[PDB]
Ligand binder design. Structure first.
Ligand code: HEC
Length: 108
């Protein structure tokens, strides 16, 4: 309801510049500092196997959807206190609409 589709292309580049240092999105891509994100939409938090999540992420048990994700990306630490995801956040909803739009396509 509060997530509007943006530019997948724009979102692709946001990812490269803000998420690529610690994550992969491809099916068969490895975990790095952060878990590979393929198929994240529809799954709950802390369920990628072979990855050592914090107690926080796990217990938060977030069901990932375009909407939740938006709030998460605004300020991960405020959303999941104790998370070791060291990203400050994405304040512009347009920047977030663009990235989730990319994510929504590339992690499927
Ligand atoms: C390293 C400096 C990171 C950057 C940059 C980004 N993320 Fe990340 N993320 C990182 C870690 C170590 C973890 C695991 C957290 C824990 O507490 O165990 C995460 C987690 C996520 C999640 C949750 C995944 C789950 O399976 O529940 C998501 C949805 C996620 N990361 C997405 C993501 C995006 C889109 C980013 C770019 C804007 C990004 N993160 C940055 C480490 C790092």
């Amino acid at each position: 309801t509060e997530f509007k589709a943006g530019s997948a292309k724009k979102g692709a580049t946001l990812f490269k510049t803000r998420c690529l240092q610690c994550h992969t999105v491809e099916k068969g891509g490895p975990h790095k500092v952060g878990p590979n994100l393929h198929g994240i939409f529809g799954r709950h938090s802390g369920q990628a196997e072979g990855y050592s999540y914090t107690d926080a992420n796990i217990k938060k048990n977030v069901l990932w959807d375009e909407n939740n994700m938006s709030e998460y990306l605004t300020n991960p630490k405020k959303y999941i206190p104790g998370t070791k995801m060291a990203f400050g956040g994405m304040k512009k909803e347009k920047d977030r609409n663009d990235l989730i739009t990319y994510l929504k396509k590339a992690t499927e």
